[PDB]
Design a binder for this molecule. Structure first.
Ligand SMILES: [Zn+2]
Ligand SMILES: [Zn+2]
Lengths: 167, 172
């Protein structure tokens, strides 16, 4: 992520919410990008099909539970390392509010009955429509609820001078 | 909140730039999300390692070429279907401007010699630091330059109301 805090992924707990970046707009509004860490870095990874199916569901369900009262979601997208999603939004909700909405969204994934209920899962509306698994998406959502969602601190995970050097 | 678009992926050309969505902040700043389509839907995909390595390089290089003169990038991230990236930014640059910066960025990927020039490629800064391939990232960047980058029209790719019913009507 562009212009982010530099945090130590070997100490990063998951699942967890973290402020990856804040930004101002020209007329003074706030934009926050959240690190929604599903998996512990370099120990766990979400599978490709599940993460894609989850991507189709996550944005809507997150909007259902998070939009309004000063918050407007711009986009939720997967991380290329496959350990989480970045969520960019207008507003400055606190991390526990995001964590509660995220958990509520994972619950919603569990009630999805069939690949047929999934928004835009067809050749006309998905770039790679074969690359899907509702059961994998549900396993991921289920693991988030089993593990709960911590709040991570940028202060606690900050890389010290010594370790940045060593790189 | 201004405009988002449901477009027909069976007719979508790539590589191409397209305005996926526009939004306004409370005090009236425009936010645009661009569909940066690398691959033709359901005919090509980028590979997992190359797309990740590309992700480490793309945001910086795009900033180098696109930021300023009214534009500030928020984030560039991969699509789960692996046919492109979404780029969210502050501002309303036109699609050809984004296409030129994107091409310039792909050129930059080509001059990356070995991975030591790849930012944050280590266990302390990357979620899955073995899942990388510079040669794959360079094949992707090269393909974009070989194919060039078109501007896609939302009006042209619009799914009509009838077809969306038909598809909404196979929800639940
Ligand atoms: Zn898709
Ligand atoms: Zn990484």
């Amino acid at each position: 992520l562009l212009d982010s805090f530099a945090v130590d992924h070997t100490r990063m707990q998951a699942p967890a919410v973290r402020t990856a970046k804040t930004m101002n707009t020209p007329h003074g509004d706030a934009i926050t990008v959240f690190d929604l860490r599903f998996c512990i870095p370099n120990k766990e990874v979400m599978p490709e099909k599940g993460i894609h199916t989850l991507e189709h569901l996550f944005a809507g369900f997150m909007r259902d539970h998070l939009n309004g009262n000063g918050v407007e979601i711009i986009d939720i997208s997967p991380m290329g390392c496959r350990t989480g999603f970045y969520m960019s939004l207008i507003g400055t909700p606190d991390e526990q509010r995001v964590a509660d909405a995220w958990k509520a969204a994972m619950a919603d994934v569990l009630k999805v009955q069939d690949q047929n209920q999934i928004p835009e899962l067809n050749v006309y509306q998905c770039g790679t429509y074969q690359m899907h698994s509702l059961s994998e998406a549900q396993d991921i959502a289920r693991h988030i609820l089993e593990r709960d969602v911590r709040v991570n601190s940028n202060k606690e995970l900050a890389l010290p001078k010594e370790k940045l050097q060593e790189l």
